[PDB]
Design an enzyme around this catalytic site. Structure first.
Site, PDB file in Angstrom:
ATOM      1  N   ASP A  77       0.850  -1.202   0.000  1.00 24.32           N
ATOM      2  CA  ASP A  77       0.000   0.000   0.000  1.00 24.32           C
ATOM      3  C   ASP A  77       0.867   1.227   0.000  1.00 24.32           C
ATOM      4  O   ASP A  77       2.054   1.176   0.395  1.00 24.32           O
ATOM      5  CB  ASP A  77      -1.024   0.038   1.133  1.00 24.32           C
ATOM      6  CG  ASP A  77      -0.411   0.015   2.509  1.00 24.32           C
ATOM      7  OD1 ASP A  77       0.453  -0.846   2.799  1.00 24.32           O
ATOM      8  OD2 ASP A  77      -0.819   0.858   3.329  1.00 24.32           O
ATOM      9  N   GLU A  92       0.024  -1.124   5.749  1.00 27.69           N
ATOM     10  CA  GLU A  92       0.958  -0.667   6.755  1.00 27.69           C
ATOM     11  C   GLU A  92       0.679   0.813   7.068  1.00 27.69           C
ATOM     12  O   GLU A  92       0.881   1.253   8.178  1.00 27.69           O
ATOM     13  CB  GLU A  92       2.409  -0.848   6.255  1.00 27.69           C
ATOM     14  CG  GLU A  92       3.546  -0.488   7.276  1.00 27.69           C
ATOM     15  CD  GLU A  92       3.892   1.034   7.336  1.00 27.69           C
ATOM     16  OE1 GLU A  92       3.522   1.788   6.402  1.00 27.69           O
ATOM     17  OE2 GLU A  92       4.511   1.468   8.372  1.00 27.69           O
TER      18      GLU A  92
HETATM   19 ZN    ZN Z   1       6.645   2.037   4.383  1.00 23.79          ZN
END
Ligand code: ZN
Ligand code: ZN
Lengths: 369, 366
Positions: free
Chosen positions: A69, A134
């Site tokens: 992501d 994350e």
């Molecule tokens: Zn990162």
């Protein structure tokens, strides 16, 4: 290795994987790994995709960890190269996720592929642990994978998190520690004068907010505590509340453990004669990787590849390392320049990505042979 | 007296005046009083109706106060006689508000009327102050009437609050005092090695003190001033700690002493804050004398017993009426069945209440 790395990086950058949407990044990666005889396992949860891919049948287990992501682009018109084009200009690869962390994710994948292809019966297990969240709320990402592995007592011995670590020159910094995080959700019940339970609660709160958890150490500032929430009463006047909720969080270093913290808080509550319930939410454990097999394998890989000796530092930017540290794995972090991460015109040197692949590969060599 | 009182009671009980809904109760009352020459003044506020009816002009101004509002009945199933019928079974009048306090409200109105009739040129002023919200928020009720009155420098010398005071036998208890009431709404600002100067820590020390400080230990006539916390809420934002607390305070302190002590405690911890204080009532204590004699003698005359004067127990708008600086006492029927199914009151007791309130007036004005 440069062109393989670059080509995979562009492929991933072209996929607009704003958290938690993977947009097929992990599907491309699983397709290349599976082709080489990696065993693929999907660990989705809610809207987050997670991949755990491994090759090998023994310890040590070496995991490459990262995320597919990326943060939002902001106004695409204020970019000099469109953020999902993956344009290369003057040896600089532009795009959102170029630095954080699709370029170094590509380098880790190519390094793992080349090692396995060259050594089909290698020692240990080489794994990739890839999350699609994350950067955002991240409740369903690496933490989900780690709880799944822990639930079934599967081990990771070592982990390289490929977050961009370098400050000014490629190789100048390796991250060898992060702080843990633990939240207490405390519910004080039942709320002559000195026996008032709100008074006993305040006595507790005063001890809590002045208790010295530690002084920190050479590598970490001192463990810090935040009172994030205090709530008693539903908003009615002239009604004494039945419960007093206190939410507190500690960002803690290796001088203490979640168990010491829980025990100290229990002692404090008992000392002040409070009845209560508490729900503890551990969001990772701190780690500090000292001189040894893991730190030396990445330090020497950097020295032998690009002739710079890294400084080992803790903190700076973010990573999922503290989640992986929850399993007892030893963790370090290395990757390219982080100066452009999360900004308009994010980019990364293509030469550096090639060197990162060589570095990751050499770390595998140093850690297994 | 009895018939007149129980006929008016019944009329009122038959209106289901859950607060703040007067349900025409006050229209009835104003009607009657209008006929006998009382000046009527309505002082509605929001969804609350309040009546201010006076006869006469001069001091002493004697006010009967109480409320037309009633608490909810629950499932009319469990009531042996319907809640808003007002049937008299076996000399007991059954109905929500029979005891609290339409019965005694009816008694007070009859006494006032009978006294004016008989003494049309009487000295002083006989009044009635009635609200449709004593039982709920009550910031719209008697305080609004009082506010209005204080604003025009209108005064009440004496006040009888018809709340039901009797414990075992009609006439055995009169309430001669109540504690005051004040709420503080506190917002402690800037709450976000050298841990002790952290605001949250300092706020905690303040909370420690506020929750144990001994304001006083009462006196001969009151229990001690108590402080209760009502709400504590906190959680980069305009980060404040909100603390709402109430004091029920006796004559040992005042609102100003309370305010000044809380300020000192805050300043001792160098806390940045703002506070809004809402003083709803003052305490009162009617010691032996003209008011207390008039109602003591009234009960002795009618019943042949002497009430014990007590402070507190149940609730009233008395502390609100004490803000005018009126002397206040409270008397009414047996309280045991208030705020309960099968609420009722003795019709014999109602008639006696009427005689009692009537004698009190005679005693006060002659
Ligand atoms: Zn990162
Ligand atoms: Zn009442």
């Amino acid at each position: 290795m440069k062109e393989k790395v670059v080509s995979l990086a562009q492929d991933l950058i072209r996929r607009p994987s704003i958290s938690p949407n993977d947009e097929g990044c992990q599907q491309i990666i699983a397709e290349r790994l599976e082709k080489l005889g990696f065993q693929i396992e999907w660990m989705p949860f809610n809207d987050t995709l997670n991949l755990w891919a491994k090759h090998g049948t023994s310890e040590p287990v070496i995991a490459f960890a990262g995320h597919t992501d990326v943060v939002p682009t902001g106004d695409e018109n204020q970019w000099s190269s469109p953020p999902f084009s993956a344009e290369i200009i003057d040896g600089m690869l532009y795009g959102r996720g170029a630095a954080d962390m699709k370029g170094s994710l590509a380098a880790m994948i190519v390094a793992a592929e080349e090692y396995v292809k060259a050594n089909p019966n290698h020692k240990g297990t080489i794994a990739l642990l890839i999350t699609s969240d994350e950067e955002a709320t991240a409740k369903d990402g690496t933490i989900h994978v780690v709880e799944t592995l822990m639930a079934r007592d599967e081990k990771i011995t070592y982990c390289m998190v490929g977050e961009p670590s370098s400050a000014k020159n490629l190789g100048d910094v390796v991250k060898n520690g992060r702080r843990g995080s633990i939240t207490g959700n405390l519910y004080i019940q039942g709320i002559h004068l000195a026996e008032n339970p709100i008074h006993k609660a305040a006595l507790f709160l005063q001890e809590l907010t002045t208790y010295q958890w530690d002084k920190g150490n050479e590598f970490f500032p001192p463990t810090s505590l935040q009172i994030a929430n205090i709530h008693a009463g539903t908003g009615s006047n002239n009604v004494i509340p039945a419960e007093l909720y206190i939410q507190f969080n500690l960002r803690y270093c290796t001088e203490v453990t979640d168990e010491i913290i829980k025990q100290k808080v229990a002692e404090m509550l008992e000392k002040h004669n409070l009845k209560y319930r508490i729900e503890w939410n551990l969001s990772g454990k701190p780690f500090l990787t000292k001189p040894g097999k893991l730190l030396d394998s990445i330090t020497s890989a950097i020295e032998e590849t690009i002739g710079i000796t890294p400084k080992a530092e803790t903190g700076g930017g973010t990573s999922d390392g503290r989640f992986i540290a929850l399993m007892g794995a030893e963790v370090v972090e290395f990757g390219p320049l982080n100066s452009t991460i999360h900004k308009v015109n994010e980019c990364v040197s293509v030469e550096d990505l090639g060197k990162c692949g060589e570095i990751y590969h050499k770390m595998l060599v140093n850690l297994l042979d």
